[PDB]
Design a binder for this molecule. Structure first.
Ligand code: K
Lengths: 144, 91, 386
RNA sequence: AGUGAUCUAGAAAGAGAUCCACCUAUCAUGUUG
């Protein structure tokens, strides 16, 4: 029911500002914020492509309060450390562009990339494909 | 009716309640300085002459001409001492 | 610093990045222009729907209301859907920042619902919960698609006319007493920018697979392109269009389709796309699923209907005979104009009966009880079709 | 670090002529060499 509620908040909004406003007005408890970010990520991964709607939504949540920023920080490291093995190449494309966008504007600090360990043992094809899309977005937005 | 410029003129004809919510999502010493220093140095001489003038006038003992003479003498003395000091410093 | 133009109904404003005071992230409706030499984003193109196109949409809604004086409730809702889908699938992300269009969408959707309400001689809000209009056709609802249950951006109009004020406030759109968020059509249509970027991707992948397929002297298998089939502009699936051997000769098809406006009184609102050449450019099947969830599921929806009184075993067997009825047997016969106009009452009667527990609910604002002759039924208002 | 801003609501008598979103369609050949 909580997943449904958040999902319907997303699907009933025209813009990321509206979606962010509705979620913020829910006054979600601090322990549920990470699960809300997880629902937002999974919803964005159901789309056929990336969308600026999710980046704007996340950005407005992050800047509203520090508890949202930390929920996004740990959701990023959660995705790279545990969830990437469950993602197909389409989902990895969307996810890489999403996190690359948030990093490219410092909503997620570039220090979050400290968890990346480019080696033949501590990385997998899912993670390397994810890194590829993330950096591709970084170069497209910022330039070399 | 609007509040702080936000709302609709009226809810009538809008097909909505008109309810407004604040968005939670939005949140070489430049020659001119040397000229001022030189002016201040010459001014100190003229300040001493004026102070002497003030003392002599307040004592109401000397005519305006005698006071002018004593001021010109002090001016000449101090100007000569200054020219000698400038010649020595430049030397 | 801004270069402006209006083309094909889109209002466009190009602002180079080098001219911006600060570069801020944007929502859908602001295209990023990439410099193909550096592969870097160098300018933003803000989009809006032109005032002329906004007026054309409003005129199409007016045309529906003016024509549908004796139309069935389902055909009125279907016309609304056709116009709404035409608008959204054509303009997409340009709608996001066009506030006058959101206002017109709210009014249009309300007027379409009012046509049904007035057809039932009652505008009483509690008599028409969202389930009556948005429940899919297969569950006896009108199957309307919503775009106006969103929050409309609001900001000081004085400042808004001089500079971009952002979105500091929201004003309500369509609303209902029930605590439920109806999905908005826009969330189910991929924006044009994303379609174009994904198209460049899938078609470059296809070009590479095509060259390898000939290097191996193979043929590309139908499921060697699975996952890309429903992607690209044109859709990858068009490569295997059944009549492609004839359609290879179809030239000037876009201008021909647009010029149809001068030779045919009734034209498709999808004048801009040809499914033979472009493929299926949208898929709204997920909207029906999510609207059922938004309404509280089948259980909650059916609680508003006469379903329990039918004694029908399961909601699964609820197959509406959408292809036969008395009015279908009668439409061919020799009938007067009065007899033909009177046939539309039949499906309206079925619709009203299905939702009758809600249409004749006791919790109404005003309403003197009138007992129905020879029955113990009380009508809380005068509703002839019921 | 989360305050405020909430249209609507039915009766009588007349009227009404229709058309376009919309369920993914490669070898298998007996023998004679
Ligand atoms: K008459």
């Amino acid at each position: 029911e909580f997943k449904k509620k958040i999902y319907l908040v997303l699907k009933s909004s025209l813009s990321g500002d509206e979606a962010a406003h509705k979620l913020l007005k829910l006054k979600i408890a601090n322990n549920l914020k990470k699960s809300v970010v997880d629902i937002i990520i999974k919803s964005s991964l159901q789309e056929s492509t990336f969308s600026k709607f999710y980046s704007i939504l996340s950005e407005r949540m992050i800047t509203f309060h520090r508890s949202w920023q930390t929920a996004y920080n740990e959701t990023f490291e959660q995705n790279y450390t545990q969830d990437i093995e469950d993602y197909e190449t389409d989902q990895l494309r969307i996810l890489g562009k999403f996190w690359g966008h948030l990093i490219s504007y410092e909503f997620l600090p570039m220090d979050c990339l400290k968890i990346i360990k480019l080696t033949e043992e501590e990385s997998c094809p899912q993670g390397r494909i994810f890194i590829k899309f993330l950096f591709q977005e970084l170069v497209n937005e910022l330039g070399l | 009716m609007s509040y702080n410029g936000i709302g609709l003129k009226s809810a009538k004809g809008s097909s909505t309640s008109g309810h407004v919510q604040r968005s939670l999502a939005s949140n070489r010493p430049l020659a001119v300085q040397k000229q001022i220093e030189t002016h201040m140095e010459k001014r100190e001489i003229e300040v001493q002459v004026s102070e002497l003038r003030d003392r002599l006038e307040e004592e109401e003992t000397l005519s305006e001409e005698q006071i002018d003479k004593k001021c010109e003498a002090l001016r000449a003395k101090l100007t000569n001492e200054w020219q000698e000091q400038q010649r020595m410093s430049s030397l | 610093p801004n270069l402006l133009f209006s083309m094909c109904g889109f209002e466009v404003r190009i602002l180079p990045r080098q001219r911006m005071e600060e570069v801020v992230s944007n929502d859908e409706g602001v295209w990023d222009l990439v410099d193909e030499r550096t592969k870097q984003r160098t300018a933003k193109a803000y989009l809006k729907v032109s005032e002329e196109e906004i007026k054309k949409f409003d005129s199409r809604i007016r045309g529906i209301l003016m024509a549908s004086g004796s139309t069935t409730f389902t055909k009125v809702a279907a016309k609304w859907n056709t116009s709404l889908i035409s608008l959204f699938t054509y303009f997409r992300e340009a709608i996001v920042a066009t506030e006058p269009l959101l206002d017109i969408l709210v009014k249009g959707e309300t007027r379409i619902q009012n046509r049904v309400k007035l057809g039932l001689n009652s505008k009483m809000p509690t008599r028409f919960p969202p389930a009556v209009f948005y429940t899919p056709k297969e569950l006896g609802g009108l199957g309307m698609i919503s775009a106006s249950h969103i929050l409309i951006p609001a900001s000081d109009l004085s400042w808004s006319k001089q500079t971009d004020t952002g979105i500091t406030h929201f004003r309500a759109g369509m609303t209902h007493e029930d605590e439920k968020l109806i999905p908005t059509i826009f969330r189910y249509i991929t924006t044009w920018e994303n379609e174009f970027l994904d198209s460049q991707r899938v078609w470059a992948e296809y070009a590479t697979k095509r060259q390898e397929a000939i290097q191996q002297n193979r043929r590309l298998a139908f499921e060697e392109l699975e996952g890309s089939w429903d992607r690209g502009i044109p859709r990858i699936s068009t490569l295997f269009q059944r009549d492609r051997h004839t359609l290879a000769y179809d030239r000037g098809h876009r201008i021909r389709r647009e010029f149809k406006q001068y030779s045919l009184e009734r034209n498709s609102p999808f004048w801009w796309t040809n499914s033979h050449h472009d493929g299926k450019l949208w898929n709204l099947n997920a909207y029906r699923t999510d609207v059922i969830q938004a309404l509280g599921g089948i259980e909650t929806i059916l609680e508003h209907t006469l379903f329990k009184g039918t004694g029908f075993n399961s909601w699964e067997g609820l197959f509406w005979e959408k292809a036969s009825g008395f009015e279908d047997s009668m439409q061919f016969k020799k009938l007067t104009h009065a007899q033909r106009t009177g046939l539309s009452q039949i499906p309206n009667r079925r619709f009203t009966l299905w939702w009758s527990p809600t249409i004749n609910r006791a919790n109404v604002y005003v309403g003197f009880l009138v007992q129905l002759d020879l029955t113990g039924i009380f009508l809380h208002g005068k509703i002839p079709t019921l």
